[PDB]
């Protein structure tokens, strides 16, 4: 007893067991199946044409026969389109990417209680605000093939997967210290590569790794990173202090995007604060409210700029 969805690009079929997995009180694999079919139809106009109308209206998610009929109608339409194409790698749209990431999470994080994450930043609620704010961040910072992206404390790797599907950075890295999210990130990685191949979608290279970003090995890695992403909301003074010492080795123009600023927004260099991180970085608050109708949220963009410090010394020598 199972349900199969044929890939629109001829990759291995998606196989679901019956009874279908339940994700939460209002979300299950049956809705995921329906939404996957709809996304493929939206993406492939010939498929929308070949498939029968009623199929996506008259369905019973609690009936094996009804769900099998729905999958069969989609599969037959896939076969017709493959026959049509017989007779003579793009990035996912934002909408498709939102669906893919949720689907990857649902097939990977089967026991969300294990994460022990009760914050708004939890992987469990990533789709609510984080996905949209990360999409806004990607459009604002505009990375190229010369960039290296690193998420410090990457959880199950959701930000890394989103950024790798959307940008052309040379490489995307996620580093996570905790055992449970790092173990789940290994499944997220496998499921993401599998689903992206199933849809026929391209993504940049990425690595999700277990590790401590405060280790000796990570000092040079942070120094050589052009874009750092970090959810530093819950960081204590020691981790915060140590991380600022790591940032102090980054190159000019290096960027840090975070949930809390590492330096005051109104930093004013003087003789008493020459040791503060504010002397070598610009800091701006980015708010989608400044066609956003979501939560009134913000993130912080830091840009390594040692001319702040240089101008202070040249101003002393040039009164
Ligand atoms: C950890 C997963 C994530 C994310 C997106 N994100 C933010 C920032 C503030 C928020 N406030 C409230 C609720 C949220 N979901 C918020 C998400 C973020 C960005 Cl864009 C840049 C740098 C750091 C962060 Cl953490
Ligand atoms: N889940 C973890 C909570 C704390 C932040 N975090 C980290 N990940 C990887 N290296 C780290 N060194 C210090 C903190 C840290 C992720």
From Swiss-Prot:
<feature type="binding site">
    <location>
        <begin position="212"/>
        <end position="213"/>
    </location>
    <ligand>
        <name>S-adenosyl-L-methionine</name>
    </ligand>
</feature>
<comment type="similarity">
    <text>Belongs to the class I-like SAM-binding methyltransferase superfamily. DOT1 family.</text>
</comment>
<feature type="binding site">
    <location>
        <begin position="149"/>
        <end position="158"/>
    </location>
    <ligand>
        <name>S-adenosyl-L-methionine</name>
    </ligand>
</feature>
<comment type="subunit">
    <text>Interacts with MLLT10.</text>
</comment>
<feature type="binding site">
    <location>
        <begin position="126"/>
        <end position="129"/>
    </location>
    <ligand>
        <name>S-adenosyl-L-methionine</name>
    </ligand>
</feature>
<feature type="domain" description="DOT1">
    <location>
        <begin position="12"/>
        <end position="317"/>
    </location>
</feature>
<feature type="modified residue" description="Phosphoserine">
    <location>
        <position position="287"/>
    </location>
</feature>
<comment type="function">
    <text>Histone methyltransferase. Methylates 'Lys-79' of histone H3. Nucleosomes are preferred as substrate compared to free histones. Binds to DNA.</text>
</comment>
<protein>
    <recommendedName>
        <fullName>Histone-lysine N-methyltransferase, H3 lysine-79 specific</fullName>
    </recommendedName>
</protein>
<feature type="binding site">
    <location>
        <position position="176"/>
    </location>
    <ligand>
        <name>S-adenosyl-L-methionine</name>
    </ligand>
</feature>
């Amino acid at each position: 007893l199972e349900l199969r969805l044929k890939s629109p690009v001829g990759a291995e079929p998606a196989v679901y067991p019956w009874p279908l997995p339940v994700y939460d009180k209002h979300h299950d694999a049956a809705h995921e199946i329906i939404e996957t079919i709809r996304w493929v139809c939206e993406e492939i106009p010939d498929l929308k044409l070949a498939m029968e109308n009623y199929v996506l209206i008259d369905y019973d998610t609690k009936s094996f026969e009804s769900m099998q009929r729905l999958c069969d109608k989609y599969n037959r339409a896939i076969d017709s389109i493959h026959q049509l194409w017989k007779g003579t790698n793009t990035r996912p749209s934002t909408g498709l990417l939102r669906h893919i990431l949720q689907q990857v999470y649902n097939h990977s994080v089967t026991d969300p209680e294990k994460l022990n994450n009760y914050e708004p930043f939890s992987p469990e609620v990533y789709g609510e605000t984080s996905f949209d704010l990360v999409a806004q961040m990607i459009d604002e910072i505009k990375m190229t093939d010369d960039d290296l992206f690193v998420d410090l404390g990457s959880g199950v790797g959701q930000v890394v997967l989103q950024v790798a599907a959307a940008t052309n950075c040379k490489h995307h890295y996620g580093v996570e210290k905790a055992d449970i999210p790092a173990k789940y990130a290994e499944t997220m990685d496998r499921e993401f590569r599998k689903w992206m191949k199933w849809y026929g979608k391209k993504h940049a290279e990425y690595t999700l790794e277990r590790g401590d970003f405060l280790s000796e090995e990570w000092r040079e890695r942070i120094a050589n990173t052009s874009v750092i992403f970090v959810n530093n909301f819950a960081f204590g003074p020691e981790v915060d202090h140590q991380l600022k010492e790591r940032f102090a080795n980054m190159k000019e123009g290096g960027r840090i995007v975070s949930s809390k600023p590492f330096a005051p927004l109104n930093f004013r260099i003087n003789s008493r604060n020459l040791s503060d991180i504010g002397t070598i970085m610009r800091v701006v608050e980015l708010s989608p409210l400044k066609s956003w109708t979501g939560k009134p949220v913000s993130y912080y963009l830091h840009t390594i700029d040692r001319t702040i410090l240089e101008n202070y010394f040249s101003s002393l020598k040039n009164p």
